[PDB]
């Protein structure tokens, strides 16, 4: 990421703060409804609105993203274990990372109107595409 993008991502994620988990759970719910093909990766999950399993999983996704923001210059190393899980174990189709990234952007636009400027939108899209590249690196 470029210095301008790093600064935009750190500033936007700071405003997200303690609500990261909530936003993560909402992004997953938006993905399951808009793109039903993504549901096949979670047969062992309760996928109903306001599910405790979706809330719990949304927190884990958000924690991984918060750790990626803090380690923005060393993302492949910080997310190494997650790459093995998604690519080797779960065999997640790479197109699904784009679908989740889009749903996270929609979630942030709906909750942070003053923060979601065109410049910040561009930086967050670049950050999520970098995260997706690391998670599919084993392919």
């Amino acid at each position: 990421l470029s210095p301008a993008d790093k600064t935009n991502v750190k500033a936007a994620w700071g405003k997200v703060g303690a609500h990261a988990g909530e936003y993560g759970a909402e992004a997953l719910e938006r993905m399951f409804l808009s793109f039903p093909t993504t549901k096949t990766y979670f047969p062992h999950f309760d996928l109903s609105h306001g599910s405790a399993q979706v809330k719990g999983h949304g927190k884990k996704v958000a924690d991984a993203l918060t750790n990626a923001v803090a380690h923005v210059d060393d993302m492949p190393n910080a997310l190494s274990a997650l790459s093995d899980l998604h690519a080797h174990k779960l065999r997640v189709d790479p197109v699904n990372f784009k679908l989740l990234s889009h749903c996270l952007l929609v979630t942030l636009a709906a909750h942070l109107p003053a923060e979601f400027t065109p410049a910040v939108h561009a930086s967050l899209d670049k950050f999520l595409a970098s995260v997706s590249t690391v998670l599919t690196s084993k392919y």
């Binding site: 889009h102 929609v106 636009a109 709906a110 109107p113 561009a122």
Partner: protein, 145 residues
């Protein structure tokens, strides 16, 4: 392809949309977020900064035409191919825009609606709009098929 509930939810929200500003914001954000799209709009003037893009009068005026085509599509959901026939020919044979970019603009429009309506743009409301933008993208890519 839309359930009666989904159709009423899309139509209700669309009537609240400020056509004079939503279109300009969607087109402007495509140029800022995906910079390769700027080569098709060189003749629009100054596109050097995000603020110059959003404030460009040709970007705002063109955005109104784009939203007008989307409004036309919502009025003829059963016949999307017929409603976008000449527009498909224009984008393909004259402009040579790759069809992947139609999906990107559809997704940017979804982000703009979420930004303007907040908590009113609920997950079932988004799901119905995703069906609409995918249909519009597919109808625009017909002259390539």
């Amino acid at each position: 392809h839309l359930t009666p509930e989904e159709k009423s939810a899309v139509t209700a929200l669309w009537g609240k949309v400020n056509v004079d500003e939503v279109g300009g914001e969607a087109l402007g954000r495509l140029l800022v977020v995906y910079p390769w799209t700027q080569r098709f709009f060189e003749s629009f003037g100054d596109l050097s900064t995000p603020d110059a893009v959003m404030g460009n009068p040709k970007v705002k005026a063109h955005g109104k035409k784009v939203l007008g085509a989307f409004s036309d599509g919502l009025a003829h959901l059963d016949n999307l191919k017929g409603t976008f026939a000449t527009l498909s020919e224009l984008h393909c044979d004259k402009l040579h825009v790759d069809p992947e970019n139609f999906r990107l603009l559809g997704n940017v429009l979804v982000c703009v609606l979420a930004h303007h309506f907040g908590k009113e743009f609920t997950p079932p409301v988004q799901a119905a709009y995703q069906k609409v933008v995918a249909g519009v993208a597919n109808a625009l890519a017909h002259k390539y098929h």
